[PDB]
């Protein structure tokens, strides 16, 4: 682990534990075992240190997804999304530091938040292209257009995300306990969407 | 012809929605209401209690609407019921943009006030989901669809819908009205999807 990656790892930890405003770069330096000045050497400032840590974790989740897609790209779209969500949930239960960090975007400077949100869209494009490509392969039911199927899926995914955050954020042991229940619920809900959207 | 107290709540809804909590003044509101400024504080301790009461009067409006719906369109099939409810909710939201603007300000408000108001909004649609919960017991659910899974699914889907709706149309009644047709059609189709996917 280079000093730059140890700094980024330390920043993920400290930012997630203290939030963006209470976290100091001193704390991050010590946690990384590096000299305070090196943070400013590798990152212009606290904003940019936060940005690049955000990018770095977003990068790991992209590789996670590229691996999974490659392995699972031939599955039915609903089977694919079910397995992906189960992978996502398992990642978060084993990566509580990264999960706590990701949620601090909320608390951040307006411009930083904007810059990061636009980068989040770019990082996920391949997922959303794949999804809408695969929705074009379904024999959709009467009056279900691809745009409708996709809106539905997004409304649903957003709702689920909200409940995940409301219920499991900062509670990795609770997510582990509930993991079988969540994965089963999700399998069934996507089966519902499958049965109702297709003929 | 509104009482002064209610004329004041109405004006408050208008002024707060237009200017936001911080820039809105009781002077603006008293002028919008047609009353003396002293009458506002006579009826409402201050601006925060005025915002609270204005917020309650709107949510009581909305909830009255649901409770009439519930007993008129009561024992319809639940998916038809829900489809129709969501259509009413949309038509109202389009015709009451001052209320929409107003509701939206809750983000920018003092935390105590915002929690206080959130508790009351939790209550506010228990009626809806208690009814849905009971109506699902009537249904012949598809294999593996438990009633618990059924209800969680409807909750998660409506929350997500709501969230994306707010993000899209917040401060855009022009986009909303332009989009209405498409949105209504989407709702009909999506609830047909739910009925077919959820029942045997």
CATH superfamily of the largest domain in chain A: Tetracycline Repressor, domain 2
What is the CATH topology assignment of the largest domain in chain A?
Tetracycline Repressor, domain 2
- Can you count the beta strands of chain A? 0
Please give the share of residues in helix of chain A: over 70%
N→C terminal distance of chain A: 53 Å
Dominant shape of chain A: elongated
CATH architecture of the largest domain in chain A: Orthogonal Bundle
Protein name (chain B): Transcriptional regulator, TetR family
InterPro entries (chain B): DNA-bd_HTH_TetR-type_CS (IPR023772), Homeodomain-like_sf (IPR009057), HTH-type_TetR-like_transc_reg (IPR050109), HTH_TetR (IPR001647), Tet_transcr_reg_TetR-rel_C_sf (IPR036271), TM_1030-like_C (IPR049488)
Domain HTH tetR-type (chain B): 2-62
GO molecular function, one term (chain B): DNA-binding transcription factor activity
């Amino acid at each position: 682990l280079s000093k730059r990656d140890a700094i980024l790892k330390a920043a993920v930890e400290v930012f997630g534990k203290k939030g963006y405003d209470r976290a100091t770069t001193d704390e991050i330096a010590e946690k990384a075992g590096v000299a305070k000045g090196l943070i400013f050497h590798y990152f212009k400032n606290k904003e940019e240190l936060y940005y690049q840590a955000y990018m770095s974790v977003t990068e790991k989740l992209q590789k996670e997804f590229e691996n999974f897609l490659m392995k699972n790209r031939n599955r039915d779209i609903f089977d694919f999304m079910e397995r992906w969500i189960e992978k996502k949930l398992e990642y978060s239960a084993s990566h509580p530091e990264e999960a706590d960090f990701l949620i601090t975007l909320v608390s951040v400077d307006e411009g930083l938040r904007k810059r990061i949100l636009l980068d989040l869209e770019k990082s996920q494009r391949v997922f959303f292209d794949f999804v809408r490509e695969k929705l074009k392969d379904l024999d959709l039911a009467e009056d279900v257009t691809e745009e409708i199927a996709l809106k539905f899926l997004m409304w649903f995914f957003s709702g689920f995300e909200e409940v995940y955050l409301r219920t499991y954020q900062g509670k990795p042991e609770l997510l582990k306990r509930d993991m079988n229940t969540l994965v089963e619920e999700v399998k069934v809900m996507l089966r519902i969407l499958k049965k109702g959207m297709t003929k």
